[PDB]
Ligand binder design. Structure first.
Ligand code: NA
Ligand code: NA
Lengths: 384, 382
């Protein structure tokens, strides 16, 4: 439940029953032979795992320092690592006898991954999304409908993510007998931060075997962007006990940390309670979740998962920030130099790895988690 | 250069030398160990090959006849099978010592694939595109520029694909010493129909191994959409000598064959010279305008190797309308959680019809040539 002092289950009493049932089901199935056979079957034949580990030779030669490798999550079905968790949890729900998935979504990217997994597995899908966010992300709303999901605009309160979370929780209280609440990052009350990390750990397990095959040794550094923290935990987790492997999470610097238009919760936030967890949040003087900004839609989440708060505390991972401008430069540079258009989220990680590689020697190795592809971001990059 | 009575090399004398040199280099590199090592290395690490073969269980059960498997070219880097050929030819060009790639593009899809492959290999990329198509395809043009390519609008003639083709040819005449002309389908003068087929044949080779692993037998039918015909040849070719495997090509029926607004060249075209080859093209003597809701099926011709397979009746060619393709687009999205390319949706639509008339122990593989992210704006605007 706890990662040092971070995590917990800060929920109304009514949710203790569904969370207990979910934890018991997860304990039973997580190492079950049949459950894992079906999960591996869907990951392989539907999602296209394993994803390759790509040596960005041109980008490496240009910078003239460490070798940069890219873990190609951009190639998973849907174009984002989110799929790995959507499948795992949707299948877990099916094994629990659930017939319905619900989820909240801010950018709509988790909404899409949940819709896709629900369609795959023949489940009903209802997605809660703040009305202001429905307005900003019309193509993701269309995608979800195309995939058979029902998008429910949340018109109450602030009409944003926090209002969608509350409606999702309220729904789940009433419908948990047949409905699974599918959380999209390493956030939420226990057991979700653990479950999501476990379903993303395939990223790091593949990358470890791939880098040993390619180079005969572990990486010197692994760099991943951090929203809620799921792609970063997924690639980090299998290396945590490899003491010499440096781990770097990259948060959204937005328009600058001084500008207050960012989403760097670890760097600039404070300890607080939200979404049923004790972790770091960007929140105002009155304890309310405060406005966040990134050019990358998926880095708008106002907090960060408790396992990252813990990793920062014990100094096992370092956490840095990259601005909108630096992420944009990296988005262009990767496209031109390697013919890979990255997600703006992932471009934050590419940006930082480019700075880091320059200092390091040529025999050293950086793996960047390329968490998604940038087709989704073409509109806004063209606008800006 | 010939596939029965189709194919050939209908070019001016100025292009004979470049084509001979390409043929000679291709013979030298196609079975060369190092060339193939590097090709497979890029296909694996950069493009993500092999693509999976997916059993569409829910779609199968819903229709209640044959098993429907999908060869998932939608998961290749870029979202379309075009990447396989773009990497192949770009690497060939590099092994020949070329520093520059040119190509023509209609919807921008081959232009994007060429631009990606050129970026990968450190080559200069110029893309000829008709000015009418440039105006209609804002996002693909942007993709191409974002990938480091230069888009050269063509304002000659009717400002369409045929004018782009003619401009690209004119360029290659001048620049061939250092420029490779990268043709995007199984079309053009020899040796291009052969080369592109050979670079797409990886699709069928994987699919053969994958279906034997899953079902212990070859499929009863293979279904693929046909524009110029590269994704179809890629999946067909390794099964051509497996006599019991039925091969079906699906052309764009558009608004309907009787409406005349379509791109069904095999079905309704006549035999003639166009783009340096003898094959079927849609005509009025002149090139006729074509239509499909799928941008990639708007090519007025078809590869000579399909003309040939049709004539000897090794493959059957059919058509599917815009409306049928759209129904299948929606159906695959809802039922399997895969948003297909509108091109690929033609194959899916036909496979769903055919599946209903077959037994539950029979097997269909559909080539899912690409993903549908690129078509969302079209489908919403509809
Ligand atoms: Na955050
Ligand atoms: Na045609």
């Amino acid at each position: 439940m706890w990662f040092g002092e971070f995590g917990g289950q800060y929920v109304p009493e009514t949710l203790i029953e569904p969370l207990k049932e979910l934890e018991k089901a997860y304990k039973r199935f997580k190492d079950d032979e049949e459950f894992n056979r079906q999960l591996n079957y869907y990951l392989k034949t539907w999602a296209g795992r394993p994803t390759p580990l790509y040596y960005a030779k041109r980008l490496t030669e240009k910078i003239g320092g460490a070798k940069i490798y890219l873990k190609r999550e951009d190639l998973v079905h849907g174009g984002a690592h989110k799929t790995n968790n959507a499948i795992g949890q949707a299948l877990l729900a099916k094994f629990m006898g659930k017939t319905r998935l619900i989820a909240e979504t801010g950018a709509g990217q988790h909404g899409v991954a949940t819709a896709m997994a629900g369609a795959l597995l023949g489940m009903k899908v209802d997605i809660y999304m703040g009305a202001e966010d429905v307005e900003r992300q019309k193509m993701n709303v269309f995608r979800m409908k195309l995939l058979g999901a029902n998008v429910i605009p949340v018109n109450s309160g602030s009409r944003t993510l926090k209002d969608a979370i509350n409606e999702a929780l309220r729904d789940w209280v009433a419908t948990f007998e047949y409905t699974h609440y599918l959380i999209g990052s390493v956030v939420g009350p226990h057991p979700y931060p653990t479950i999501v990390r476990d379903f993303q750990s395939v990223i790091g397990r593949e990358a470890k075997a791939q880098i040993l095959e390619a180079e005969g040794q572990l990486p010197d550094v692994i760099v991943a962007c951090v929203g809620g923290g799921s792609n970063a935990m997924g690639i980090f987790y299998p290396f945590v006990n490899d003491k010499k492997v440096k781990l770097v999470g990259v948060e959204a610097g937005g328009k600058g940390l001084e500008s207050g238009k960012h989403s760097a919760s670890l760097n600039a936030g404070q300890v607080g309670v939200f979404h049923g967890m004790l972790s770091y949040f960007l929140q105002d003087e009155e304890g309310q979740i405060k406005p966040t900004h990134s050019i990358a839609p998926g880095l708008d989440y106002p907090g960060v998962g408790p396992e990252h708060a813990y990793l920062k505390k014990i100094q096992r991972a370092e956490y840095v920030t990259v601005t909108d401008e630096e992420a944009l430069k990296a988005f262009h540079e990767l496209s031109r130099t390697e013919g890979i258009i990255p997600a703006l989220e992932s471009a934050h990680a590419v940006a930082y790895a480019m700075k880091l590689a320059k200092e390091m020697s040529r025999d050293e190795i950086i793996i960047v988690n390329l968490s998604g592809r940038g087709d989704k971001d073409l509109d806004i990059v063209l606008k800006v």
